[PDB]
Every structure is written in structure tokens, then in C-alpha cells.
């Protein structure tokens, strides 16, 4: 089965591929933000939103991945390939989970309309060659 | 962040651990069931249910963990520690995801109330001595 985590919310992996990989914040910073702004709703016994459901599940999956990798690293005796393991983990799953956390936190804070328009406009900005694109990139904001 | 994947639904890790671990079907069987019965609803661009959202996210997390484990198994060479990591996975994460998929599929099929009362009933049953319980294990059915 082929599931897209954003098709349910109005987006797709192509739309969120307008943003580069180095655009997305660290998973630690995104989790800090999630806590700060929606801790009491994510720890709540309510279907507060599909975004909350998804964010809970994603936080748990990330925890499970980290648990596995930690048990691994601590149970192994070779600390040399422990560099390539984190390289792969980050490069592959950290990007997915950063994309995901970002999308959910941003669509909770700013809205679906705003986040879709942001994706489109940032695709414009980044498709544009550097000799003709402003320095003030699109920024997602309430002010 | 102390999130319970079921609190949003009306259950708990304690309640789903009220059933024995050798009761939950395999991840393969449960994914086959999910496909057969709800593929077109999970691949849909709609919030059909919080159970649908959670099932999507859980299927994807299982995929990520499987990719990681396969890559790790390619890396590591010794069948001993390879079977060891498989054991750890299927013991902790395997069980978590079996419980999760079972809960969501079963609720989608039968009802949250039905599934929770079934948890309770089957736990009381498996804990009651045989001479003073109904001889046949509770089964969850549609007919």
C-alpha cells in the first residue's frame, strides 16, 4: 500500500519538495516548538485535530527509531561505523520527520491556505535564478 | 512529551497490555487485513477517521523501521547478533505495532466500545480459572 502522509491534508511529497533539504529545521528545534505550543493538546484525551493525531504518531515513531538506534550503538563494540549509521538515519528519516513536523506545526500555527501558498511562493523564489530573486525570501509569519 | 497513542481514542497501554502478547496477530497478517479492507480509504485524500490517520502514520513508521533494520542487517554480518536485533525488534517494536494495528483495524471494523469491552472481557477471561469461565475464548465477529 502506498500512503502519502500529506494527501490527507491537501499536499503531497512533490509540493513539499519545493523546499530544499537544508531548509527544514532540526528535529530537536521542531520538537521544542511542538512542546512549547501544543503540549497540553498533544497530551490530551481528545481528537483535537488530525494534525494532532499525526504529530503524536510521528513523535512516537521517532522515539522508536531513536530507541532502536541507541540500543544498537550501546550494544555494539565497534564505534567506527556508528558514524555511517547516524549519517544514514539522519539523511533519510530525519529529513522525512523534519518535513512532517514542519508541515504539521506550520499548518496548526498558520493554516492550510497559508502553508500551501507559502510552498508555491517559495518554489517560485527558489526556481528563480539567484541573479533575479530578491533577498527577502517568503517567510511564514503572523506579523 | 508523554504521549499515549490510545488516550486520544479511549484506551491505554495498560489496557492493551491487559491482553497477553501472544494474542496479537502478526504485522504481516494485520497489514494484509488493513490493505484488503481499507486500502482505498487509507490512500484517499480525506480525513476519513482518526483511526485512518493513525493507521497511515503507523504503517509508515513500520516501513521506516523496516528500512533501518534491513540496512543494519546488511551492515552487520554475524547471524547471531542479526537474529538478536530481529528478536529485540519483534519483542518491543513488533509488539507495539501489533497492538496498534490490531486496535485501529478492530475499532474500524467493530466499534471502539466493542473493542474496549473485548479487551476487558478477554483479560478477565484469560485470568479466570478454566473451571469457572466459559470454555471458549472470546472472539470478535461481525456475523
Amino acid at each position: 500500500m502506498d500512503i502519502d502522509p500529506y494527501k490527507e491534508f491537501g499536499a503531497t511529497v512533490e509540493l513539499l519538495s519545493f523546499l530544499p533539504s537544508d531548509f527544514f529545521p532540526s528535529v530537536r528545534d521542531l520538537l521544542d516548538t511542538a512542546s512549547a505550543l501544543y503540549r497540553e493538546a498533544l497530551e490530551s484525551p481528545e481528537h483535537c485535530s488530525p494534525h494532532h493525531t499525526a504529530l503524536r504518531q510521528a513523535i512516537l515513531c521517532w522515539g522508536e527509531l531513536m530507541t532502536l538506534a541507541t540500543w544498537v550503538g550501546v550494544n555494539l563494540e565497534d564505534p567506527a561505523s556508528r558514524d555511517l549509521v547516524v549519517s544514514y538515519v539522519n539523511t533519510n528519516m530525519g529529513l522525512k520527520f523534519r518535513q512532517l513536523l514542519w508541515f504539521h506545526i506550520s499548518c496548526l500555527t498558520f493554516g492550510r491556505e497559508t502553508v500551501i501558498e507559502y510552498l508555491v511562493s517559495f518554489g517560485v523564489w527558489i526556481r528563480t535564478p539567484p541573479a533575479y530573486r530578491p533577498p527577502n525570501a517568503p517567510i511564514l509569519s503572523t506579523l | 512529551m508523554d504521549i499515549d497513542p490510545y488516550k486520544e481514542f479511549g484506551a491505554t497501554v495498560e489496557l492493551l497490555s491487559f491482553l497477553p502478547s501472544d494474542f496479537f496477530p502478526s504485522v504481516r497478517d494485520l497489514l494484509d487485513t488493513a490493505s484488503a479492507l481499507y486500502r482505498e480509504a487509507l490512500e484517499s485524500p480525506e480525513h476519513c477517521s482518526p483511526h485512518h490517520t493513525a493507521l497511515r502514520q503507523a504503517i509508515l513508521c513500520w516501513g521506516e523501521l523496516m528500512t533501518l533494520a534491513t540496512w543494519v542487517g546488511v551492515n552487520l554480518e554475524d547471524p547471531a547478533s542479526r537474529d538478536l536485533v530481529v528478536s529485540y525488534v519483534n519483542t518491543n517494536m513488533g509488539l507495539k505495532f501489533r497492538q496498534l494495528l490490531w486496535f485501529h483495524i478492530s475499532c474500524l471494523t467493530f466499534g471502539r466500545e466493542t473493542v474496549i469491552e473485548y479487551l476487558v472481557s478477554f483479560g478477565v477471561w484469560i485470568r479466570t480459572p478454566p473451571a469457572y469461565r466459559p470454555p471458549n475464548a472470546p472472539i470478535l465477529s461481525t456475523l
Binding site: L76, E77 | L76, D78, S81
Partner: peptide, 5 residues
């Protein structure tokens, strides 16, 4: 508890 690659 042993590794390669």
C-alpha cells in the same frame, strides 16, 4: 554485539 561496514 559485533559490527561490520
Amino acid at each position: 554485539s559485533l559490527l561490520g561496514r
